[PDB]
């Protein structure tokens, strides 16, 4: 308990060093035990801890830090909200051979936590950046979650505020829409990406085949407020296709519904009850493979498509640079 | 105007000739923090009462908690939402995939719950069933309100009240009771030294009153059973 | 038990502080802070000047 | 009816004391003359 270390200055310096060098466990343990033993954690300390947790994509740890901060009555700020949203967006997920990577994230409502963080950031008067909105949308549209309605609402408010769409968010939202069978919304998202100029989406532009069709919510509201007549508007016609008398139309529609339900009820072998978007989809934050990225852009700086295999950066009988290397 | 003090920026010259420029906020470490005022006018703290953690003391959050938060159990729509969420919770528990559970006594977990990496395996199902027990004890009288036959006039008044407020029909009440009975029969039986709760908790439930209420509603309706 | 737990947590904090490596010498800390006893003690109450 | 506040706050409160100069409504100086 030397006086050189029993001071807030050295504690903050070591906390910054761990947040910039080591993993999230070091910062969490050091902060919690210092708080227990007598070091007071201010806004700077909490923001450093949350920066580390967001960088490593931890959700439960972020929630615990938020609870401790609220208990200690530390007021958050824009950096705190940004870190919370970024951590919730960087929470690792996916399926690896019918094995779910992060099933605890299902019960940890990180999408709701991020949405509340964004709402608080906007309400308190801080400047919410586009990365926060994109991370909030990703939290809704990750493969384990199906919240495309709230994702659409968030994207509409983003477009009204003229925000920027990230390629990763666009890809995840498109995958979610295709998985949830929303071709109209997927085409709209693709057209928006092509118009804005998102990287990789400058050529995925397609004609709108639902140009004259009303919304599903519109037809539902019309039915709630003749449903037999509204069925003709609900069903799409090709122009050269003409309606049939309603008595036979009802039978035909019932036949089509029964056939579609029978087709979709059939189990898909070897799919593990997972969609094609969820098959072989494991996402982890870039902190996991930062060393791989750095050494790839050194050993194969001019061969980006080449695989970063060992013996390119180390001889035989000698250690390679990256300890974990591929995965763990 | 409550101006926030600035960090102390120091430049140090290493003997090797390097320079280190770092800003240590020494002022805002002992001085009290400068709180800000929300743009909307009042500060809104983020809510974290719905998250599920490895907190052994806290009960596992359920969707029934959101409906119980309001407390307006008189509303028929609220009652229907409560019933739907409770049935969903019980059905999720019954159909839970119990592949890698492995619930056996571990010595090292005497003064704490299961390990962080063992939460889903040897803690999740027990917490889920304890939450089911708590939610049932909270909302049993809402899902299956107590019946009172009284005399003939009392029965007439009870029937009039039931027809005025048929919040839940006999079919859905029976479905809820069936899922509750299935969960009770497939409850968690093995207790651990780490279990801070009472040992009598891990026992099947007694649903005599609920059976009586659902029977009352079944005889209230004209034909509960069909040849199908 | 409270005091023993506090001592154990302090020992854990020392083990964590071991991560920082060897501690720097006095002049770094001495030049880190230009604070004086006046600013140190004005936080609680302002003492009258000596007479 | 309303779910209780999380009793896990005891763990956060464990081995913690209210700082005199870190209270939400504490000023400098801590004690003011009458």
């Amino acid at each position: 308990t030397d006086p050189v270390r029993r001071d807030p200055t050295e504690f903050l310096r070591v906390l910054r060093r761990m947040s910039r060098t080591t993993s999230w466990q070091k910062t969490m343990l050091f902060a919690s035990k210092g708080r227990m033993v007598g070091y007071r954690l201010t806004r700077e300390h909490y923001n450093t801890v949350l920066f580390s947790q967001s960088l490593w994509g931890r959700a439960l740890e972020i929630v615990r830090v938020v609870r401790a901060m609220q208990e200690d009555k530390v007021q958050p700020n824009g950096a705190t909200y940004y870190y919370i949203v970024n951590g919730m967006g960087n929470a690792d997920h996916g399926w690896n051979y019918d094995f779910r990577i992060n099933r605890r994230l299902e019960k940890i409502q990180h999408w709701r936590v991020a949405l509340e963080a964004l709402e608080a950031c906007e309400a308190n008067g801080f400047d919410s950046t586009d990365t926060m909105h994109n991370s909030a949308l990703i939290t809704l549209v990750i493969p384990g979650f199906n919240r495309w309605q709230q994702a659409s609402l968030l994207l509409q408010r983003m477009l009204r505020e003229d925000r920027r769409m990230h390629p990763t968010m666009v890809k995840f939202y498109h995958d979610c829409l295709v998985r949830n069978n929303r071709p109209r919304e997927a085409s709209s998202l693709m057209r928006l990406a092509a118009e804005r100029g998102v990287h990789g989406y400058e050529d995925k532009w397609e004609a709108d085949v639902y140009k004259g069709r009303p919304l599903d919510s519109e037809v539902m509201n019309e039915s709630e407020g003749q449903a037999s007549s509204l069925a003709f508007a609900s069903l799409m016609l090709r122009g050269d296709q003409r309606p049939l008398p309603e008595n036979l139309q009802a039978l035909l529609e019932e036949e089509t519904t029964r056939n579609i339900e029978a087709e979709r009820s059939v189990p898909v072998p070897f799919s593990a009850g997972l969609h094609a978007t969820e098959i072989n989809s494991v996402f982890r934050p870039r902190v996991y493979r930062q060393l791989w990225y750095k050494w790839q852009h050194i050993a194969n700086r001019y061969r980006p498509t080449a695989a970063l295999k060992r013996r390119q950066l180390a001889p035989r009988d000698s250690p390679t640079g990256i300890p974990g290397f591929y995965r763990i | 105007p409550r101006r926030i003090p600035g960090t102390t920026k120091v430049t140090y010259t290493n003997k090797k000739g390097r320079t280190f420029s770092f800003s240590v906020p020494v002022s805002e470490l002992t001085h009290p923090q400068v709180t800000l005022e929300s743009a909307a006018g009042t500060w809104r703290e983020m809510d974290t009462s719905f998250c599920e953690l490895g907190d052994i003391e806290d009960d596992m959050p359920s969707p029934v908690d959101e409906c119980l938060r309001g407390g307006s159990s008189l509303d028929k729509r609220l009652i229907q939402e409560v019933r739907e969420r409770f049935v969903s919770f019980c059905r999720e528990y019954v159909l839970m995939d119990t592949s890698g559970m492995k619930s056996t006594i571990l010595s090292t977990e005497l003064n704490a719950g299961p390990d962080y990496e063992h939460y889903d395996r040897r803690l999740r199902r027990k917490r889920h069933w304890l939450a089911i027990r708590h939610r049932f004890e909270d909302v049993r009288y809402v899902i299956w309100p107590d019946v009172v036959e009284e005399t003939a006039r009392g029965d007439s008044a009870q029937a009039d009240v039931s027809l005025t407020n048929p919040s839940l029909t006999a079919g859905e009440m029976l479905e809820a009771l069936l899922w509750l009975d299935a969960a009770s029969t497939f409850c968690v039986r093995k207790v651990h030294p780490s279990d801070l709760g009472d040992k009598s908790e891990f026992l099947p439930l007694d649903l005599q009153r609920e059976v009586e209420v659902v029977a009352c509603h079944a005889r209230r309706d004209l034909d509960f059973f069909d040849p199908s | 038990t409270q005091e023993k737990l506090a001592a154990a947590i302090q020992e854990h904090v020392q083990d964590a502080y071991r991560f920082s490596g060897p501690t720097p010498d006095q002049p770094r800390n001495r030049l880190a802070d230009p604070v004086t006893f006046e600013d140190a003690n004005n936080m609680i109450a302002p003492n009258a000047p000596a007479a | 009816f309303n779910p209780v506040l999380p009793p896990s706050t005891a763990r956060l409160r464990l081995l913690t004391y209210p700082m005199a100069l870190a209270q939400p409504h504490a000023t400098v100086p801590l004690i003011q003359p009458t």
Binding site: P3, V4 | - | - | M19
Partner: peptide
């Protein structure tokens, strides 16, 4: 000597516990 340095007084007054009044 670093312990004797005046910043220790700042640390002590910052970490001074609040005393509750008797009820």
């Amino acid at each position: 000597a670093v312990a004797n340095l005046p910043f220790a007084k700042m640390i002590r007054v910052g970490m001074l516990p609040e005393l509750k009044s008797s009820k």
